[PDB]
Amino acid sequence: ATHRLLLLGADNSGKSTIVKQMIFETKFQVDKVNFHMFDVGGQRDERRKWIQCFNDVTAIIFVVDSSDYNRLQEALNDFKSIWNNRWLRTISVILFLNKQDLLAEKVLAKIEDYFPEFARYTTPEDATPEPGEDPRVTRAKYFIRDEFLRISTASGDGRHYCYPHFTCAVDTENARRIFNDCKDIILQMNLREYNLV
Amino acid sequence: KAILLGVILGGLILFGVLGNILVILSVACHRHLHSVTHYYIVNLAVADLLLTSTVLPFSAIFEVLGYWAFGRVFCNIWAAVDVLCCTASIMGLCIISIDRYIGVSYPLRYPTIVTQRRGLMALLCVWALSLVISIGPLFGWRQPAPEDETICQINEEPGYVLFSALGSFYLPLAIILVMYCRVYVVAKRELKFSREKKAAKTLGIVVGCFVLCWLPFFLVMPIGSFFPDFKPSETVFKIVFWLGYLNSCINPIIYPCSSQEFKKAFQNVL
Amino acid sequence: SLRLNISAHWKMGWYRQAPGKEREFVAGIGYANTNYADSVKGRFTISRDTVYLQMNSTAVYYCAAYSYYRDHSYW
Ligand SMILES: [NH3+]C[C@H](O)c1ccc(O)c(O)c1
């Protein structure tokens, strides 16, 4: 059983490194379920498969480096592009906020300089970091996640979801993330099909 | 009072046969409607069609006239085809329930747990078990019946009716209720009022119509053939005997409207 | 020559048990119809209220009563 993922990502944003966790198609498997992940380049030089891979996909893996604040607004522009597109507007998007370990070093040096309204946002409720976490680092990480969710909540449709995750550079537990999110996407489509939701 | 019951039975027969030919015709052209659950829906549709096209007009004529005007081989064909079609549609609902349970609790390993190597073996197993129950007392458990060419007795021989009731209703009723219990558990996201009430309305009908149709008959018949102190009248017996026929006219309404592409294909007729 | 439970929609018939032969249908009267056989089509009529035949001009008979759809009997 194949599942054609669509990895867009960004250039020099941990995407080629997170590929190596076994334009170029790749393949991997979890619990003898075979995902076939289509890379595309980063949505800056190769928009060729946007007609071809427009419908057969089951998810869209968008990975973004989170430490570099200077290259942050272009990522939000690309996420507003793909989230409110035409051909790929009914596909749920997995979001990988990569290089959180680099963000833990890039904070302690400010995120309020490149984006001015950071202090207006605070660390919200129903949030759980890892053990031994600085509150400013978690505030910055949840600030950019809340920015991506503000861009995500700008359709009002409920026809396609979005699943964010905080992954480090050399995390081994990342294929189970895509496994569980593809399971949830297919289960939501199955519940919509049987008129249960 | 003969033509009035005849015209309401003809209306119910015509509505049921038109619904089942529409359900079986809406799949025969679309190549997208070729999965295993569509097979399990057209199997229920062809069982309800085989019941409603042949067995229902003869029982309607038998209720209007009051006597089976045809022969005796016709009666022995009619009772066996009646039992065959009714328990074939019941076990079709049972395998639809099993398919939906292993469709909502293994969403990625579903095409590696349901294949045509074994999605058309459960179909032949329930059709063969239906034919075992129907052609059971054609040699096995038939009591000696009177030799009229006018009456047509049902096969109310005890010992056979208990086995048939158990392994034709009460095991598929248990299977349908526990698998739809799991489907209702998973479909509660597992603001939430619209998530719970949207499932408790669309599973409530698909168990309520089946129980309300078949549980009167399959409760009256073995309790009356084993405990003859109840002794139900002729009117309540005809009511519970005809609710089971009403189920095969209800099933065109529910089960294509419990999908998305089936409802579009059925609404494409007008 | 010789003439020879209670419900409403129950049919009542008469059979002839011959020597060695099986139970052949002879006559029957019900609330919905009244059926006969070819052997006694003219030589024997029926009568119902008790239920008895009436023959004019093969020696053992059985008066039976039964239903039309449910598997009951009263011999
Ligand atoms: N109308 C139901 C049909 O006559 C039927 C179904 C299952 C039975 O065991 C039976 O005796 C009769």
Residue numbers in the entry:
A (entry chain B): 14 to 35, 51 to 137, 141 to 228
B (entry chain A): 25 to 214, 262 to 341
C (entry chain D): 17 to 20, 27 to 71, 76 to 83, 89 to 106
Study authors write:
The α1A-adrenergic receptor (α1AAR) belongs to the family of G protein-coupled receptors that respond to adrenaline and noradrenaline. Adrenergic receptors (ARs), which mediate physiological responses to the neurotransmitter noradrenaline (norepinephrine) and the hormone adrenaline (epinephrine), are family A G protein-coupled receptors (GPCRs). Here, we present three cryo-electron microscopy structures of human α1AAR bound to the endogenous agonist noradrenaline, its selective agonist oxymetazoline, and the antagonist tamsulosin, with resolutions range from 2.9 Å to 3.5 Å. Our active and inactive α1AAR structures reveal the activation mechanism and distinct ligand binding modes for noradrenaline compared with other adrenergic receptor subtypes.
Subsequently, we also solved the Nb29-α1AAR-miniGsq complex bound with noradrenaline at a global resolution of 3.5 Å. Although the map quality allowed the model building of the receptor with clear electron density for the ligand, the map density for Nb29 is weak. The weaker map density is in agreement with the observation that Nb29 preferentially binds to oxymetazoline-bound receptors over noradrenaline-bound receptors. The binding pocket of noradrenaline is formed by residues in TMs 3, 5, 6, and 7. The para-hydroxyl forms a hydrogen bond with S1885.42, whereas meta-hydroxyl does not form polar interaction but is close to M2926.55, a unique residue among ARs. Noradrenaline forms extensive non-polar interactions with highly conserved aromatic residues among ARs, including Y1845.38, F2886.51, and F2896.52. The Nb29 binding interactions are almost identical in oxymetazoline- and noradrenaline-bound Nb29-α1AAR complexes, but the map resolution is relatively poor in the noradrenaline-bound state. The ligand-binding modes of the endogenous agonist noradrenaline and the imidazoline-type agonist oxymetazoline demonstrated a key aromatic interaction involving F3127.39, which is conserved in αARs, and distinct ligand recognition by the unique residue M2926.55.
